[PDB]
Every structure is written in C-alpha cells, then in structure tokens.
C-alpha cells in the first residue's frame, strides 16, 4: 500500500523479509522495539534446544511448530509485528531464516540512523588530541552525515599512523606502509635511471 522507503536496497528471500519487517516497523515506529525482540529471539534459540528443534528438525509437523510459536508468544510486550512475523516464519518452516534476517535488519537500522561502524588500528594508544585530529581525517571517507562509531585497536607493526577498516573499504594511512611504498618506488626508479 503506502509503506516507507527502505534506507538501502538488499538481496533476496532473507533480506527481503528484513526490508518488509523494517518498513512495517517504521510504519508503526517500533524500530528499536522489534530489533530488541529479534536479539532476544537470537538469545532464545541460543538458550534452549527445544526451540531450535522447531527450526532444524524436519520431522516436526507444521501444526506443532505454528501452535508452539503461537502459544508461547501470546503476551509480554512482543509487538504484533514480531508475533505475526514468527507466525509467518513458523508456518513455512523458515524459522532458520531468523539468524540471517536480523543481520539485514541490523544493516537497515544502521543505515536509517546514518551511522557507520569503523575500526582504527593505531600503533600506539591514542590521546585526546591524537583522536580528535583523526576523526576529522576519518570523516572524509563517508559521503554524507554518517557519524562513525570509533573502535580502537593496537598493532606495533605499524610505525605510527592509522589504518581505518570500514568493512567495505580500508584506508592505510600508516607509516609502515609508507616506508614500504617508498622503497618500492625508489627501487623502481634506480632500475630505470
């Protein structure tokens, strides 16, 4: 009908369930609620064996699975979105699609907030001036008002500088790489001149 536009487009049959779940939850403005219920369901399948038996065992009938998922999800602040979603995934035997629908829901939510998770690998631990002059250098690697979520790391094999890891792209602004590409260029010149 009239659903909100998804923040970023995705692949098929496990991410389309997440895009539909996101558009329904943004139509109800329960975006942080059903993400929390999805995390609670990940932990639920982590905790008990009888619950993941309804997702892995092929000999449980559909009637048992849909009636257990209906009867155990009657109340307790679970939204109509999550309860109808688990009815819809239990009706089809597709309860195994939860672990792959939550990561696409997470990517959808991490795109509606205009954020970006990153990893800064520095040779030494950072100060409160060695960090503040880094993020203004790191914010030119996003193309909009994306606020990076700083993640610091340590690696002594860098000789100072920083490496950014955006999980999509990697900027090697280190010195140990700079003295590597210095020697390659100076050796590729002396073999010419």
């Amino acid at each position: 009908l009239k659903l909100p536009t998804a923040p970023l487009q995705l692949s098929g049959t496990s991410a389309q369930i997440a895009t539909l779940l996101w558009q329904v939850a943004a139509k109800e403005n329960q975006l942080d609620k059903v993400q929390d219920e999805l995390y609670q369901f990940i932990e639920l399948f982590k905790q008990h064996s009888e619950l993941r038996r309804l997702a892995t065992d092929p000999f449980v009938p559909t009637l048992v699975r849909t009636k257990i998922i209906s009867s155990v999800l009657k109340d307790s602040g679970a939204s109509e979105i999550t309860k109808k979603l688990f009815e819809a995934l239990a009706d089809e035997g597709a309860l195994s699609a939860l672990l792959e629908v939550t990561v696409n829901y997470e990517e959808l939510m991490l795109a509606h907030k205009k954020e970006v998770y990153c990893t800064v690998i520095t040779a030494e631990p950072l100060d409160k001036l060695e960090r503040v002059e880094l993020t203004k250098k790191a914010e030119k690697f996003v193309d909009a008002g994306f606020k990076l979520v700083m993640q610091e790391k340590i690696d002594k094999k860098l000789l100072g500088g920083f490496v950014i890891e955006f999980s999509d792209r990697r900027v090697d602004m280190s010195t140990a790489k700079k003295v590597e590409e210095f020697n390659n260029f100076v050796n590729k010149l002396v073999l010419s001149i």
Partner: peptide, 29 residues
C-alpha cells in the same frame, strides 16, 4: 556453539516473501 545449526536458512519455498507479506502487512494497526 549451538547457534551454528541456524547458519544457513533452509527454504522449502521460493515465494516466501508473499506469505510473510500476507502476514506482516496486517500487523500494521
């Protein structure tokens, strides 16, 4: 780690999106 059983989704149908949209669009109030 028992979550490794749920790593790959086992889809018994291809048009599952139509069934879950028949059940998630009526979840809107």
């Amino acid at each position: 780690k028992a979550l490794d059983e749920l790593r790959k989704p086992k889809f018994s149908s291809k048009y599952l999106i139509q069934h879950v949209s028949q059940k998630l669009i009526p979840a809107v109030k």
